[PDB]
Nucleic acid binder design. Sequence first.
RNA 1: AAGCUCCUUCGACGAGUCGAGUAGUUUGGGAAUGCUGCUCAAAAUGGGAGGUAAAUUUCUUCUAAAGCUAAAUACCGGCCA
RNA 2: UUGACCUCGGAUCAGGUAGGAGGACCCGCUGAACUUAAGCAUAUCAAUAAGCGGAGGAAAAGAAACCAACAGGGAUUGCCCUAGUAACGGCGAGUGAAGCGGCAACAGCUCAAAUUUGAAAGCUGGCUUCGGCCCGCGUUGUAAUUUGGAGAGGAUGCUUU
Lengths: 74, 183, 117, 103, 50, 29, 188, 21, 88, 58, 204
Amino acid sequence: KTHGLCRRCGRRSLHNQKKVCASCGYPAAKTRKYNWSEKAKRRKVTGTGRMRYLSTVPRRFKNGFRTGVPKGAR
Amino acid sequence: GALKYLEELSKKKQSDVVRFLLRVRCWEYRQLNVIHRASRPSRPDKARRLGYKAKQGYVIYRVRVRRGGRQLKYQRSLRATAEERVGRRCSNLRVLNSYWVNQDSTYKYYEVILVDPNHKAIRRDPRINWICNPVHKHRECRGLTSTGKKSRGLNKGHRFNKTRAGRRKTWKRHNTLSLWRYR
Amino acid sequence: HFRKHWQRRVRCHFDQPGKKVTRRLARRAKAAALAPRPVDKLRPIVRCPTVKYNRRTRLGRGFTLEELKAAGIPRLLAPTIGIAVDHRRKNLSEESLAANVQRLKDYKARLILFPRK
Amino acid sequence: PNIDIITAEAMTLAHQLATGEKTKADLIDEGYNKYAFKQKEGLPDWFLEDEAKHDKPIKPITKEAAQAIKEKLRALNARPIKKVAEARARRKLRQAKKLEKLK
Amino acid sequence: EDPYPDTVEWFTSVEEKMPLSAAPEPKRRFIPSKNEAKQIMKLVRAIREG
Amino acid sequence: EDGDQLERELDAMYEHYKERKASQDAKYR
Amino acid sequence: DLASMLPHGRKDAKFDTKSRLYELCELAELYNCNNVLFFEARKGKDLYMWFSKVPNGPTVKFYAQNLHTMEELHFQGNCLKGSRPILSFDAAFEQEPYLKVIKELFLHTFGVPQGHKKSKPFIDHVLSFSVADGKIWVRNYEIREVEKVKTDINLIEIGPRFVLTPIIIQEGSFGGPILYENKRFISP
Amino acid sequence: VLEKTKKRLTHFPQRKYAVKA
Amino acid sequence: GHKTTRRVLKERPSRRKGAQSKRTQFVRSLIREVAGLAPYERRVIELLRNGKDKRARKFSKKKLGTFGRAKRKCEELQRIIAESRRAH
Amino acid sequence: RELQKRKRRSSRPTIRMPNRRKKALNPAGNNIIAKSWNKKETLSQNYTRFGLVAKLGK
Amino acid sequence: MVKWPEYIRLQRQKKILRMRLKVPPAIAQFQYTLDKNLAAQAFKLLNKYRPETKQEKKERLLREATAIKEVSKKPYTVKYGLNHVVGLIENKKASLVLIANDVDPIELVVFLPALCRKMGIPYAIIKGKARLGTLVHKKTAAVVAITEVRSEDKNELAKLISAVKEGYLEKVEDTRKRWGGGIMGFKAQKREEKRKKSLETAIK
RNA sequence: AAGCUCCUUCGACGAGUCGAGUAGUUUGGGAAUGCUGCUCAAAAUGGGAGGUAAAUUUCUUCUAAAGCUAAAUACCGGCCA
RNA sequence: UUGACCUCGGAUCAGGUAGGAGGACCCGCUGAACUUAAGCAUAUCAAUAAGCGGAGGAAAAGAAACCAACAGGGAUUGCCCUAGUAACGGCGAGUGAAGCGGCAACAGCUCAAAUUUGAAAGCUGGCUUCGGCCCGCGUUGUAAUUUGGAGAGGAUGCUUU
Ligand SMILES: [Zn+2]
């Protein structure tokens, strides 16, 4: 078989000779994307995943990125 | 007033004193790396008029660029390629300006002024802390240095109609169809 | 004249009443910060350059240094009391000097200046 | 002393001077350039060889100057009847194998 | 030719008898230092405040 | 004093550098 | 085109319009020339031609219009480069005194002296000057020889067409007293 | 701010004024 | 055109950009002694000393590119010869 | 677009932005203009009542 | 054979190149330097007028502050600073000027001997920017000047001026207009002879 | 510390950069419209761009080769309405 | 012998910063062909698409080496007309601005070139009992003053914190 499991995108698209992923280009620091495919861009853009940290930023903007603890709290 | 004497000396680059010094320094720079750090500017009059100060946060870097051509002609100067390679080498610094120092038949030599935006001396001092702002990240990449402004044709007059306020911006404004509500 | 891709560069101004409201609220905002002051600076009266428009007159950028001095307004005080100053323009005739001196005098007569702190 | 024109660039200056294109006055006057009045006498070999690799002046050559140099520097047994014959025979055979492969 | 000719001093052989600058001298070159008195009064405030 | 002895060795390493670099090709050997 | 006509002519580069007009005389002394043909241009559209003897002689300023150069493919004529031309003048050139001054300056500029080593040994073209309106019309023609029917000359146009409008004639080299003024010149 | 800027704002600040109609 | 009474304006300090500074002319003359002469300036110096003044101006145009630049360059180099024979 | 769909499926609250403006629309404080300003009126209408001018231009 | 480091080889090559290259006379004059005695006699006067250190300046500010909480002459001091000394030379205030001989961009001081000569100020090229740098309380100092001294040693300053301008300036009057360098040794002379031997049959 | 005033005192302004030649590209724009490479390489009552047949380059208007700066302008993305 | 300075190194040294994502809009670099000219090669498509680098809530541009020829205008940006005009193209297919004018919005400034020289007056650290202690950077120049429709320095008398 000419492709194995990539470790960055999880697809079975890592070449066993070139050792380069055909979907993301794993040894490269940048993730592979091109503008001639809008379908490929929307398959891996923000929002396709879980959003551990980026979903918590807008609530902290609303209150002004404040620190501390409300007065009188136990 | 030693710097006015230095300014007139750099006007006479073909004279005996300057051509001797530029010969022995061209050999010295070729013995060193393509990009390396200079402790002090080799042309202190030129660096000071371009905005260099002997403060903690200002550094000087020397760079060679291979001269010639690609018959295709590159639209940016060799000074621009010199600035981008130094900025890639020193990613934490900001490129302020650069100047010519030496010239060979194979290489052009430049010295780049860099400013540290996280040094406290730079940040507390006005008239330099504009470079600490995030709008000035990689000015040499976007053509905001002195050689960049010349290449983009950003000069006043009837001789720069297509290039003032951006060439692609002026082209786009001239090629949109504007339709109002009451036509 | 549609040899290019005009379909990807076409601007429709459906925000014409929306931007009018935005501009009027921006004018209201600077009237709230500068409450008794006008929202505009006083501007000189100049003559249009070309021979097509010699007979007509319009508002210029700022008052000259010489016409500011003849009216009794100091240089460093004029921007603080709402007067635009143009260091590039020149008088070049007594007619342009006299009209702007009279305009600055009429502004002085109608001015209420508050005593600092 | 014998002056032998080996480089194609010296041939280019020779073609210019021998034709009525550059005079004796123009050659002397244009020899006062930035590569002039540079000493090479007592200088070390490591200093001078670094310069000669990196200070060749960039002035163009002509194709007739380059043609004169190769025909001057051609050897006497470079193109004999025997070697030209086998070279033509080798090229004819190479086309025959291509026709065999296309067969 | 002489490839390394000696320098003929055509300009420096005539000695200039006056300074280049005809600008006046300030009072500060003739009087005690104003900066010195300011640093002293800054120190006086610190000793007075302890 | 005139750097003769220092110049002797500096040319010796330069010749040694030239022969070492040029001998990396089998044709020159 | 005109420099190719003149074997005794030396071409000269851009002259500073911010200089003085008598610096042309210092310029022509340097190149050892006793005639100056000055092409002066205004506004990037107009042409003015000056003819002058260099130290002391007269100087005439023309306005050149209706230019048609050799590269235009409708002429069908060609001649030797550097050959001695036959100068065709008009009868008006010998009647008016100001046209007599212009004729001598035309004979000096387009003369091609007799034994010049850069010239050509045969005659195949004629340079013509004609006063039709209050202007001078300049034409070149090729002397083409045709065998006579039981030889004759036919003229085929070769080169530059340009109309010269005489503006002024000076007594000095590029400045001095005014001997003739047009007083009918309508400038562009 | 620079102390040349601070001196200009100290002695010539933006004033409060009105214009009669 | 229209009859408007003219007034005279103050001399513009930007119009004084034409340099008359005695200190800068001092520095330029002192640096010229220190720095020396370019290779092409030596050719002009030799041609002016030999009396070939016409050849000097032709050569200096071909090196500089303008009659105005060729005229000035031969004039500064002429005064160097004048002041050198005065010192010698 | 895909991020906007991700919010609709998720049980995370929609963070509603209050309508805050960079610049205020009415004068404030204890001075003569702020006590005599009418919020429902316009800039020219308030300056008419005050007796002042608003635009010095044409 | 053993290999030197790059930076050791580079600075040793520069030492050879200073000797072999024929330097222009503005550079060449910095080779000639005053002897051990005149250097030591000049520093006998300059050490008397040393600028005060940061510690004893703070003590003097504190002493005058304490007296105020509970009449001085003009300070006389060795003048330093390149833009400061050049202004003093041009204004004809410096009585004696001492220039370092190892300024790394040499252009900074290449005009100073010509400027001192035109202005008429006695000058001397010292050996060491570090020794001048320790006379003032710094690391390096390119130039050092004396404007005025106290009344006790006006005679010794005038003797030092007569010492420098006669015991240093008269020897360099002979050799400051001519080019330096050309200190070719035995190996360089054999290598030049081998070069000219090769260009005797057929210059290629 | 600062603003103005007066004057028998001074008044420093950016070079491998302008410019010339050439090649390529670009523009409505060979006074090359701009840009880049190579060769040569400046000035100080200077330099740049214009006006002008008007009699000689007269006149007009600006100071390049260092730098910062909100608003009116754009917006298929971001937080919302 | 010892000690300075210069250049160049080491450390998991003390404290920092860069990379990736996003890329609708923005600043650059690189750069086609289909099409049209009923074919096609200059031209047009198009200084576009694709490719590469770099930011922000805007970016960029920006306070004249400008426009103009006037009775003058006066940093930049955008809208309306200017105008399918000038100008350039076998003076084909065609390509194609700008000044003035009417509005929206307007805001001006910082250096280098001058010696504080009767006093490096400037600043990074890191030890603190938080007030001030040292280590250094720096005179090959850090503060103050000045930035050419200006300015300095003296004198002079009012006016401002
Ligand atoms: Zn992958």
